[PDB]
Write a protein that binds this ligand. Structure first.
Ligand code: YCL
Ligand code: YCL
Ligand code: CA
Ligand code: CA
Ligand code: CA
Ligand code: CA
Ligand code: CA
Ligand code: CA
Ligand code: CA
Ligand code: CA
Ligand code: CA
Ligand code: CA
Lengths: 624, 624
């Protein structure tokens, strides 16, 4: 809106911006009746009576060529009076601040969805600079023209009379609350807005001009940042030299900072990671083969950088950030800060590879803070609400006690603040190590919802063993090929069966948690045979290598080698698992991980990581 | 949900909680065809074939009298087989956690609105304890039974067999993220949940029992607290003595903490405040009269406690918090921390009087942080969105610069986090002092929307003076009854008219800001005649006492005495204002505030404060 106020005691000079509703105050200094005659470029909606209800409104069709080149004449006449005249001289200008608010690569509110509106900003948290230790956004400089591709275009367009900025100035600003979270460079780079600076006078020439800005974000959405940054242009009248500058017009663009998004096992793999370790050459060769079959590059951290840390699942999680103009992978580096600590910083973070961390870095850290305790489900629809990018899953206790553990609050808050994968707290504190990958995986399926949840299941392993004893193989030896144990003795062991009944309860609680939060039906779930035992603090560990803890590379599964009882040439555990999964068109390979991984309380999934293809569905089309 | 898993190789013992969907796993250990026969208290939905699609579901009608007193028999028969039988013994219990979730005084999601759902918690931030300096909630103790009335009732009801808690235990908990924000006392007080303690074992006897808890909140909604606290009961199986406790059932109540809410001038007054100061007796007498006419108690801070601080509008804002069971007023104490600093702490905070503060208390403080720069509009509906408790208004600059000021971020965030009065940033930085009460007030009206916005208006004062000169009074003296000035000289003064044109722009910008954000139409607005002048840093001060800066006590207005030009016995400024407002049925009194207040850059509204009647509309029925 804008009130132009007119008098007959003087002519008034005003500016109108195209797209704005200007209104005329005719009554406040009038002296009955009035008529309005305006130049041709000024259209007036509304031989008229001076009732204070009288709405007079002015609209311009085009930018002025010169100052005051449009004109409105208001005359106040009546019953026996010749006219008193009030003059108004207008200058019309275009001032459009544009960004990719339709989300194609190109209100001031941001809206979610396919019919929604608002531009997107990436946190510029990768490292396109050769030989540097810090993220691109840690400084107020654009060093490589490659770096501009990560940034979002914003354009100011002006159409004015040549002499217009003799008396007006334009300023760009961000609220002080948000200046720490955005940086803005003016294009022909040097910064115009940023953490040191919430506003800047633009240097624009009269006539027809177009000025490009490049915007990056410096922070992901989090507890104290919902994730919107508004940038505003204000047109100032600076024509009286004594008086302060007067604002004539503001306009704004609202951006939303892209969340950090995980990729489930159902997304096709692109790159694999693991460590080289002492006597581990045959584990590493086995993964290499599997990668080849699934078409993945492969990367190994060596014994020098490892610091003898083998658990490549735990220190990091590879995600992505996504904007219409640019999608890039970003690593979320766990505060667990073990031997693998540096590997996210030096080796993964890089050209088109983002970085992020959270949590206390000098410690105050559970094991539930390791990223074997961070998964995502596949996409899933739950009582009519779509989670098209899946729902994040992480382990916890059922309630908080003195003895209980949790993933650190700052990570919990970060994941939720991401919004787009509405986390779900599962129960994993019953496990010694405490990770959800210890009792669940997800695999692609050619039918139903296009996946299956695999849950570890003692019951199924009791059933198998019983079905083998029933068919005469009670003398068969677990751990054939450590102390061997026979199926008749495993089965009759009453205390082992109590432990496994209690693990069964823990897994079952989660089965139903996943059935409700994730929309699953029993035909979405397969049980993998798996025995556990309780050890220190009645916490659970795998009795034999945890098969459900597997590397999923599309259809090629790297499953820990259970070394089960060998019947008619084969491990019955291997055969049972193949019978459960081959009908889905999965290919099971069984990798020896026993003295290398299993005895140190982890398996194949725990010894490795995977980068996968980001979802084709665009996060901003969700309506969380 | 819950899977009971049955075998024919053993009978199983399970518990069912009333209101829960129990399901039976018949296939996992079956050995074709099955039938189900259950005791009379167990109803089974579902002479049946063993297809793994077969859904079997169990529902109980009532609490068990003894353990295992209901019974399910599953038999697996077939083509030539007599039955193998699997037994299941059930015990049914009631475990209901109840609170005032319908909001009358009496899903686990909280919902806004008249058809919404969820209990309400008050921050227990008043001081019902005699002789104490701290808020009730600063400690983990309930000292007065009066204090319980501020708290929210929550009840656990159990119906079990007598011997039930021999093998089960109940625990109450809050997530660790929220334990710093709630405290929970068990009733016959001593705490069961709180900032030191996120869980507690309840001591409940078998049979029919009912246990009351009293809940208070320790924190208002704010940037890092959306304002929901969930409390959960979990039923644990503790019958195997080696094994960890197993969760059998959780249920929860979600509370929402009440926001802090302001009251506009359109709400009827209840109590008035001001200071006793040096030569100010006649200001104080004038307010006293006005209070009496409007039926308000009256309170004065004396020269001893003042520390010579006269600005009773600035240090505090009296609001309220509201819950079905209890509504109480709460003072929001400004960080400006001037001479009035202690007055909120010692004199206002008290029995059924809450307290809150925000911002850096040792300074880093603008003048825009004073609470003359905090107002609320009346209730208002804006393009179809209702703000039934009004919208908070506070002053700012138009953009951020080196020289510009703002209300401190922590207050800004606090007000927004309150949600229910969606703040609006107005432009007041152009004023020397910098407060929105310097250019706007609101008054009750008997028509239209039931109020008017009054805006300071130089134009209207130029018009009046011109209309008086026109009728021959150019020689009339402003400041009659300091150096006097005549209407002909005020009018011809060209530099005074430039200042006032520039103030006109500043007020006009806000007029349209309020027209859009607040839904107003011109017939909602009255202009009060008011001249300003520009002084240090071209910042604006009142040329004569700022009339729009008035005390509104229902229909009785305490307006600063302008001491205008006296024409036919009367100040024309007084007469113009009376002509604008008497037709609304307002009663204007003009209070001398000139050497006492006006020359120290403030007026009557600035010398005073008011507590008013909280809205009848309940904040939780809004849908922000
Ligand atoms: C599935 C998963 N994410 N597993 C990670 C579990 C492995 C580590 N293990 C150890 O720290 C460990 C245990 C015994 C002996 C040596 C070591 C070691 O390599 O330091 C864990 N428990 O977090
Ligand atoms: C309308 C409103 N909220 N006004 C408050 C403005 C008053 C104070 N004034 C002073 O601090 C002041 C100015 C000059 C001489 C003495 C004093 C004084 O009492 O300390 C303000 N400017 O904030
Ligand atoms: Ca940079
Ligand atoms: Ca970059
Ligand atoms: Ca780390
Ligand atoms: Ca890049
Ligand atoms: Ca993971
Ligand atoms: Ca207390
Ligand atoms: Ca109390
Ligand atoms: Ca204070
Ligand atoms: Ca009280
Ligand atoms: Ca106020």
């Amino acid at each position: 809106g804008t009130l132009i106020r007119v008098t007959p005691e003087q002519p008034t000079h005003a500016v109108c911006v195209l797209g704005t509703l200007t209104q005329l105050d005719i009554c406040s200094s009038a002296p009955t009746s009035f008529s309005i005659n305006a130049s041709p470029g000024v259209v007036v909606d509304i031989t008229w009576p001076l009732d204070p209800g009288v709405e007079v409104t002015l609209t311009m069709k085009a930018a002025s060529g010169s100052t005051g080149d449009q004109k409105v004449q208001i005359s106040y006449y009546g019953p026996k009076t010749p006219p008193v005249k009030a003059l108004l001289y207008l200058t019309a200008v275009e001032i459009s601040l544009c960004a990719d608010i339709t989300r194609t690569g190109k209100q001031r509110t941001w809206t979610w969805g396919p019919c929604g509106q608002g531009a997107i900003l990436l946190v510029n948290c990768d490292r396109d600079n050769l030989e540097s230790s810090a993220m691109d956004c840690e400084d107020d400089e654009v060093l490589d023209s490659e770096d501009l591709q990560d940034m979002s275009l914003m354009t100011l367009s002006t159409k004015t009379p040549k002499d217009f900025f003799t008396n007006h100035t334009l300023v760009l600003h961000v609220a002080r609350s948000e200046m720490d979270k955005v940086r803005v460079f003016q294009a022909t780079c040097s910064v115009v807005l940023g953490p040191k600076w919430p506003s800047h006078y633009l240097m624009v020439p009269g006539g027809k001009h177009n000025m490009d800005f490049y915007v990056e974000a410096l922070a992901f959405p989090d507890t104290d940042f919902p994730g919107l940054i508004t940038l505003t242009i204000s047109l100032l009248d600076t024509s009286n030299l004594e008086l302060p500058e007067a604002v004539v017009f503001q306009d704004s663009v609202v951006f939303r900072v892209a969340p950090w998004i995980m990729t489930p096992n159902t997304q096709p793999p692109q790159e694999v990671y693991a460590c080289s370790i002492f006597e581990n050459e045959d584990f590493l060769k086995s993964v290499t083969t599997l990668a080849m079959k699934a078409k993945c590059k492969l990367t190994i951290c060596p014994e020098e950088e490892n610091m003898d840390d083998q658990w490549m699942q735990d220190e990091m999680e590879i995600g992505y950030i996504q904007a219409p103009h640019k999608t890039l992978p970003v690593v979320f580096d766990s505060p667990r800060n073990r031997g693998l600590k540096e590997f996210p910083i030096k080796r993964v973070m890089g050209p088109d590879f983002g970085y992020v961390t959270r949590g206390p870095q000098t410690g105050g850290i559970s094991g539930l803070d390791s990223f074997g305790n961070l998964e995502v489900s596949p996409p899933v629809t739950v009582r009519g609400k779509e989670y098209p990018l899946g729902r994040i899953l992480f382990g916890d206790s059922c309630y908080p006690s003195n003895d209980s553990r949790q993933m650190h609050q700052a990570l919990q808050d970060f994941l939720s603040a991401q919004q787009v994968q509405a986390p779900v707290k599962l129960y994993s504190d019953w496990l010694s190590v405490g990770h959800v990958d210890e009792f669940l995986s997800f695999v692609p399926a050619p039918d139903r919802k296009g996946f299956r949840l695999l849950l570890a299941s003692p019951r199924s392993c009791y059933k198998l063993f019983q079905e083998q004893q029933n068919e005469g193989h009670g003398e068969a030896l677990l751990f054939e090929g450590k102390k061997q144990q026979k199926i008749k003795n495993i089965l009759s062991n009453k205390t082992l069966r109590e432990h496994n009944s209690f693990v069964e309860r823990c897994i079952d609680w989660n089965r139903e948690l996943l059935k409700r939060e994730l929309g699953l039906a029993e035909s979405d779930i397969i049980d993998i045979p798996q025995l556990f035992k309780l050890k220190e603090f009645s916490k659970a560990e795998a009795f034999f290598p945890n098969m459900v803890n597997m590397l999923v590379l599309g259809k090629h599964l790297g499953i820990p080698k259970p070394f089960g009882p060998v019947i008619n040439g084969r491990c019955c555990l291997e055969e049972k698992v193949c019978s459960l999964l081959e009908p889905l068109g999965l290919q099971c390979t069984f990798i020896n991980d026993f003295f290398t991984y299993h005895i140190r309380h982890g398996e194949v999934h725990c010894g490795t990581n995977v980068r996968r293809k980001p979802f084709s569905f665009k996060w901003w089309n969700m309506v969380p």
